[PDB]
């Protein structure tokens, strides 16, 4: 019946990667970036960027002819945060409103069991 895609959505802290692949993650269907979507350097982490990105990659996905899709978000992970972003939520809303048949949503974020030392320091990383 339907044909499914792999909507890997990297929700970076200052970026948004919306990459869709085929089965086994090998045939890379599309890939887009938040700043490329909205040509600004503050807005590379914009929910509006997520909206336009999801609309455009949905256009490409309906272009190639994939109807249904399992979507897998992924945060920064690592020693950084492992919680995906409001850009990720915005992109999810925008693709759901784009109307590609969502089969299943996943949060595959690379979580360290026991990692190394972060770039923060003894007093804190940011601010």
């Amino acid at each position: 019946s339907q044909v499914f895609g792999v909507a890997r959505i990297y929700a970076s802290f200052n970026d948004t990667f919306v990459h869709v692949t085929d089965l086994s993650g090998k045939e890379t269907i599309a890939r887009v970036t938040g700043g490329m979507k909205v040509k600004a350097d503050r807005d590379e982490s914009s929910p509006y960027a997520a909206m336009l990105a999801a609309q455009d990659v949905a256009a490409k996905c309906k272009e190639v002819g994939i109807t249904a899709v399992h979507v897998k978000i992924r945060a920064t992970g690592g020693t950084r945060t492992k919680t995906p972003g409001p850009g990720g939520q915005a992109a999810l809303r925008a693709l759901a409103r784009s109307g590609l048949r969502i089969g299943r949503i996943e949060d595959v974020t690379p979580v360290p069991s026991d990692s190394t030392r972060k770039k923060g320091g003894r007093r804190g990383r940011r601010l």
Partner: peptide, 12 residues
């Protein structure tokens, strides 16, 4: 498995 027919992949 029940539904062996699952997923199509794209060869380049």
């Amino acid at each position: 498995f029940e539904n062996r027919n699952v997923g199509k992949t794209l060869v380049n």
